[PDB]
Each structure stands twice: as C-alpha cells, then as structure tokens.
C-alpha cells in the first residue's frame, strides 16, 4: 500500500519540490543526507515519506518511537545502523531528558558513550555516518537546542479534496473495489484534509455498500453511507452540528460563556477544548473575537437558516 | 594483659627475632613491614599483636574477618595515623570483594572509595598514611597466593611447654588471690594440651575442688587428687579418649575400623568423634587415619599398659 517513489506520493507538491533537490544533491555527492525534521498534523503521511526517502536513497530504514527509548538508544544505533540509513523517530518531542542529551553528540559528531559494570569506564563508539528523521506536530513542542542539529526542516500541509480522491481511488484499485470518481471526490471532501481519515472513510463506505450487493459504489450509495455515518457536506460530525446549534440559537453569535458550555452538554470541558473547536476554526465558520466566540455567516448558511 | 615483650610468657623463638625486627624498625623511624602470624587456635595471637603495638608505641585498630566489602575503606581512612597498626584476626574469612580492596592498600597505600553510593556510581583513589597490617589465621590453606605475597614477615606460633603453662597458671592464681605451689602448677600445665585456655580451665577446676575441700593452699598432692577426680592422665586424655583407645584396641584388635563402626561402638556422633576427640589422639602418636579405617599405633598399646601386638 505504501508508495515507493516521490512520483507515487500523492499531494505534497511544495515539500517535494525541495525534497527532490536535496535528495538529488545528496545522491550526486555520494554522502548521507542531512538530518531532517518533519512537522505537520497527524495522519498526513510522515512515515510514508520517510519510507519513500529511504527507497529513493536506496538505504535501510529503522523506524522507532519517541517514548520507546537510556542506553537502548545506543543499542539500536550500534548494531543495525550501517553507512547512512534513515532512523525515523516518531513523536520526537516526547524524548526524555536522558537520551535527548545523548542524541546531540551522536548526531553531531557520531560518537556515543556507554557505562555499565563495576571498572564501568566510558567506552566511546565511532558510529557510522547516518541520517536521522524526526516527526512532531508543532515547532514549539521541541526545545530550541534540538531544533538546531537538523539541517533540513520542512512543513507538511493538508491535502486538497482532489488529492484525497486520487488516494481513495488508488486504494480502491489496489484492494479490488470499483468506485466512481465522483464518489471518491465526495469522500475526500468529507475528509478533514487527512489521508488516514479518507482511508477509514472509504473502508466504511465499502462496508456499507458490500451488504447492499452493489458491485460499483455509486455516488448515491456513498452519500447514503456517509449520511448513515453521520457526516454532513462539510465533514462535521453530529457533535459539531449540535454545538454550533446551541451556540447560534442560544446566543445569536455572542459569547458562549463557560457556565453554559457544560449546561447544554452535561460534559466536562474536555474534547470541547481540543477536539471540536480546532476544526470549526479551520473551516472558518467560527471566529475567536476578543469579546467572545462568534459564529460567522458560514455557520448561518450551513445550518439551513435563512440569510440575514 | 601483658604490655611489654618481656612480660609475654613463652614464645621464646619468635620473641628473639621479634625483638630484632622491632628494634630495626624503630631505629629507621619507619613502620614495620606487614606481619602474618600462623598457629593453631588457642595460643594468643591477639595478645602478641597488642604487645607488638605497645612495643612500637602505636595505637591499635582491631578487626575480625567477618565483621560487617566497603567497611575496609572506613576502618582504613577513619582512625589510621602515621605508622598505625591494623590487626585483622581470622584474615582467611575475608570476602573476595573485601580481599580485592586491601592489597592496593598494602603495596601502594592507595584505596579506591565508592563516593556516589546507591546506583552504579564512580570511585576515587585516596591516599592513606603508611601503616603496618598484622594478620592472624589458623588455616593457611585458605590464604590465596596474592594475599600471602604482600606479607613481608611470616611467623609461626608454636605450642607452649609445661613450664610456660605453669607460669600462666601462677599469673592467674596471683590475679585471683589463690595460693598455689610451683609443682602443682607444673602438674596442671603438664596435663594441659599445650594451650593456655586449657591450662586456665584446669586451674579453675582444681581451685573449685580445693576451695570445697576447705584448703587454704594448693600443693602438689591436692592438685593430684583434683586432677584424678577430674579423670585425667599424665598426658591429658580424659576418660572418653582412653575409652576410644580401649575400644579400638580390644574390641577391634587395633585394626582398621572406620568412623561409623567406631562411633556406633562408642555410642557417639561420628562427627563428634572425628572433630573433637581424634585431633589430640593424633599429634600424640596414638592413632592413625588409614584409607581402610583408623588404626592404633604402638604408643597407644604402651600408654594403656597393654602387651605389644
Ligand atoms: N602468652 C600469654 N601470656 C599472658 N596472657 C596470655 C598469653 N596468651 C594468652 N593470654 C591470655 O589470653 C587472653 C586472650 O585470649 P588469647 O588466648 O590470647 O587468644 P588467642 O591466643 O588468639 O587464642 P585463640 O586460639 O586465637 S581463641 C587474655 O586474658 C591474655 O592474658
Ligand atoms: N501521499 C500518500 N500516498 C499514498 N498513501 C499515503 C500517502 N500518505 C499517507 N498514505 C497512507 O497513510 C499511511 C501512513 O499514514 P500515517 O502513518 O497515519 O501518518 P503519520 O505517520 O503522520 O501518522 C500509509 O499506510 C499510506 O498508505
Ligand atoms: Mg581461635
């Protein structure tokens, strides 16, 4: 399922325009690529990009997690790491302050130290040249000392609906399910600009279409399945629709107030503060005015209300 | 507790060279070389260590083998001055971890100390004052070759004589205020097994008998009846050792017997027979340990008044 070429990678055009240059230069100079840091929201394809980079350079790759790592970091750098090989570390911001300090000598001078057994004298290993790739959601999650050893720093942006449609069609042709292009476009539009969301949504749609016995997933069947899942034309869930309703019909675009936030939902200020608001702000239907949160005209028109 | 080397009772052969070594060490204003004292238990090596320390005019640091690994550093760095004396009684009981921390302090006077403690931390080498270490072991076999290699002077403690034991008995009687004659103390020392503890115990028992008898002075004869009532020969064997020899000679013909059969005949524990009564039956020429059993020598026949084989 994972692509093995920058050409097969779907929709990170701006990032690829420079990644191709850097990889071409590194290959021409016959030396390992400089350490790379990938930003961007989850689900966009960072691990796939790491695998694509390794395949482009023709070298082995050793994905490991952030909180997976003491001396075990040197254990995994010493045995399986030959001349330059991508070492992907997902969630680089979660490193403890015990191996992060050990990363700097290893990724600057390629030397590591291990002490155990008492003797217990320091043993310094001449690590082979290698490239490290790290992934984190935001620039501010990692410390400034860590955002200095990375030669290349790149950002990863949300996919457009067309690119998600192409990915859904590729998944369908790989699995062996025939789908019309318009159904894939609708599925991509309902996806919140995320690849794995589109994958899961297509899997659910094909699950709903298999029981009906339809051989081709038509646009009408896709729309019915998406409505059954509880998604509108903008991809908002039922929780988003109901919070928008209880804002617009109870305050008329004014501040919601902390007291009334849990009154109409009977829920703690949990997912409301981190799972619901970010997408509503991203879609542009909610604006954080200093006086209070204001539902824009997009909310009024989207919720089936007459124009003001 | 003797203080000077002239007050020590009966280590004449050792004292003769000890005087020379101590005088040579004092003349050079240099600490004595490390000393190791061999000898069977019960001969007073700690008293000799105290006498040596007093003669050198230096304080003590007395410690046994099984005392507490890291306490060696504590005892070496706490109360050791220039030329201080450390006496490790039963030095063959030191653990290997504690053994491989002392010879650096014997050949170079540098000790590595664990400073961080707790988890696996680092160590620092610390300099110590020059000192002399006296070791005392009854089992030379368990002393490894490296440990024996660092000892400059090695000497042996030998068994006392009836006269030195008599002198010890006289000293104890004088301390306790009991009047005893020279020949009585000589008899008590003769019936001892060349050991000071045994001589003192015999003297105390004879004192009990004489005091119960209401006698103000212990003479030769009173000691003789006291030791006869104690069941003792002219050589120091109790009734049990004579019984062992008589059973070995009469019941089994003196030939090889074995521990189990002899112990069954005597109604005694085989380990008790082997580890309590036999070692003094040997060392007197009264018994042998053949691979086929235990044999009685001709000295056993002569001692018991039996015809020779
Ligand atoms: N030669 C001696 N002169 C005077 N007192 C002695 C002598 N030997 C031992 N003692 C006394 O014995 C007591 C100390 O015990 P010791 O018999 O010296 O220990 P030890 O010689 O090491 O015997 P073992 O076999 O090691 S238990 C003190 O009361 C000393 O006065
Ligand atoms: N551009 C792309 N083209 C094809 N498949 C993709 C692309 N981006 C992501 N995928 C799919 O998504 C999966 C990896 O996404 P994921 O691991 O969720 O991203 P992240 O590592 O940021 O969490 C892969 O199985 C891959 O098939
Ligand atoms: Mg002893």
């Amino acid at each position: 399922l994972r692509p093995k070429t920058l050409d097969e990678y779907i929709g990170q055009e701006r990032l690829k325009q420079k990644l191709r240059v850097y990889l071409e230069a590194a290959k021409a100079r016959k030396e390992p690529l400089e350490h790379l840091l990938l930003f961007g929201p989850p689900g966009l394809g960072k691990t796939t990009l790491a695998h694509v980079i390794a395949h482009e350079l023709g070298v082995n790759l050793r994905v490991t997690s952030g909180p997976a790592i003491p001396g075990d970091l040197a254990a995994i750098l010493a045995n399986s790491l030959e001349e330059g090989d991508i070492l992907f570390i997902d969630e680089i911001h979660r490193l403890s302050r015990q191996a992060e300090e050990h990363l700097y000598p290893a990724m600057e001078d390629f030397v590591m130290d291990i002490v155990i057994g008492q003797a217990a004298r320091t043993i310094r290993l001449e690590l082979p040249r290698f490239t490290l790739i790290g992934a984190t959601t935001r620039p501010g999650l990692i410390t400034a000392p860590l955002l200095s050893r990375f030669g290349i720093v790149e950002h990863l942006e949300y996919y457009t609906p067309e690119e998600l449609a192409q990915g859904v069609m590729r998944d369908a042709r790989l699995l062996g399910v025939r789908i019309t292009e318009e159904a894939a476009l609708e599925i991509g539009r309902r996806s919140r600009g995320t690849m794995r969301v589109a994958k899961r949504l297509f899997r659910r749609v094909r699950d709903f279409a298999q029981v009906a016995g339809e051989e081709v997933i038509t646009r009408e069947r896709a729309l019915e399945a998406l409505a059954a899942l509880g998604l509108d034309e903008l991809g908002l869930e039922k929780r988003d629709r109901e919070i928008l309703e209880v804002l617009i019909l109870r305050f008329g675009g004014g501040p919601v107030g902390l007291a009334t936030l849990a009154t109409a939902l009977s829920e703690d200020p949990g997912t409301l503060e981190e799972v619901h608001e970010p997408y509503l702000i991203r879609q542009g239907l909610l604006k954080r005015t200093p006086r209070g949160r204001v539902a824009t005209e997009l909310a009024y028109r989207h919720l089936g209300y007459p124009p003001p």
Side-chain angles (χ1 to χ4, degrees), chain A residues 1-61 63-111 113-308:
Chain A
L1 306 168
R2 285 194 214 273
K4 287 293 132 160
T5 309
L6 287 174
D7 291 330
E8 294 178 35
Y9 205 81
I10 287 296
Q12 292 298 330
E13 295 297 318
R14 297 293 300 275
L15 180 143
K16 270 158 58 191
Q17 263 206 290
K18 292 175 279 188
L19 209 49
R20 195 181 316 278
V21 160
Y22 299 155
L23 266 66
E24 279 171 9
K27 207 71 172 293
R29 278 189 317 231
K30 266 162 282 182
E31 47 181 7
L33 188 85
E34 288 176 74
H35 308 261
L36 176 64
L37 191 53
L38 295 160
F39 295 141
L44 290 181
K46 279 177 257 184
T47 309
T48 300
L49 186 58
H51 272 99
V52 162
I53 284 165
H55 197 257
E56 288 291 325
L57 295 175
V59 298
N60 198 81
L61 187 153
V63 174
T64 183
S65 181
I69 297 90
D72 54 356
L73 164 67
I76 75 178
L77 294 174
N79 55 2
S80 66
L81 267 295
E82 305 169 353
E83 196 70 13
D85 295 332
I86 295 89
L87 174 76
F88 187 85
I89 301 194
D90 203 359
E91 292 198 308
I92 197 73
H93 65 277
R94 291 254 284 282
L95 286 175
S96 56
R97 198 209 87 214
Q98 193 69 36
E100 177 194 341
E101 316 298 332
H102 263 287
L103 260 188
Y104 309 149
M107 91 169 59
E108 286 177 353
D109 298 299
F110 306 114
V111 299
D113 297 339
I114 297 96
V115 297
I116 179 158
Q118 53 102 26
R121 58 191 68 188
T122 64
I123 301 142
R124 162 157 277 97
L125 282 79
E126 190 164 350
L127 290 190
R129 278 198 76 161
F130 71 102
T131 182
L132 187 143
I133 297 196
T136 178
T137 313
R138 266 185 291 111
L141 272 173
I142 54 156
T143 56
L146 191 58
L147 191 41
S148 298
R149 281 88 171 156
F150 289 111
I152 317 166
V153 165
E154 304 276 20
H155 277 270
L156 203 69
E157 46 165 6
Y158 294 101
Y159 299 83
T160 71
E162 298 95 312
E163 306 158 318
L164 292 160
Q166 308 153 26
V168 164
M169 290 215 77
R170 168 178 191 279
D171 200 343
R173 84 176 50 257
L174 285 181
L175 186 61
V177 181
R178 292 139 55 209
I179 183 167
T180 317
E181 51 90 14
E182 73 205 340
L185 197 155
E186 209 68 30
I187 286 187
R189 183 175 283 125
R190 261 149 192 78
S191 310
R192 312 149 160 252
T194 313
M195 206 75 228
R196 70 150 63 257
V197 169
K199 306 287 103 175
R200 155 168 63 93
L201 203 69
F202 165 69
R203 287 206 285 276
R204 301 281 79 77
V205 163
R206 83 172 268 267
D207 264 332
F208 280 111
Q210 192 156 83
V211 291
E214 207 166 4
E215 64 278 4
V216 161
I217 308 185
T218 54
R219 176 195 165 77
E220 311 320 303
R221 200 76 188 97
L223 281 154
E224 281 195 0
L226 292 160
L229 284 157
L231 299 183
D232 53 357
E233 88 272 14
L234 297 191
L236 277 75
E237 302 184 9
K238 294 305 181 192
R239 273 72 176 173
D240 306 332
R241 298 188 55 84
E242 64 89 20
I243 185 180
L244 291 183
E245 274 312 312
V246 304
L247 192 145
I248 187 180
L249 288 192
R250 304 181 163 261
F251 289 108
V256 56
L258 271 297
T260 74
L261 272 163
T263 303
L265 315 179
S266 83
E267 290 154 351
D268 292 328
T271 69
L272 184 134
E273 294 210 301
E274 206 56 41
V275 188
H276 298 289
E277 291 163 27
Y279 189 50
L280 310 174
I281 307 180
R282 264 192 47 228
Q283 281 304 129
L285 60 84
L286 184 63
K287 150 163 49 68
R288 267 185 298 172
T289 312
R291 286 178 69 193
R293 304 161 204 269
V294 172
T296 68
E297 297 198 309
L298 303 163
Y300 273 76
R301 294 172 211 211
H302 167 64
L303 295 164
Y305 286 140

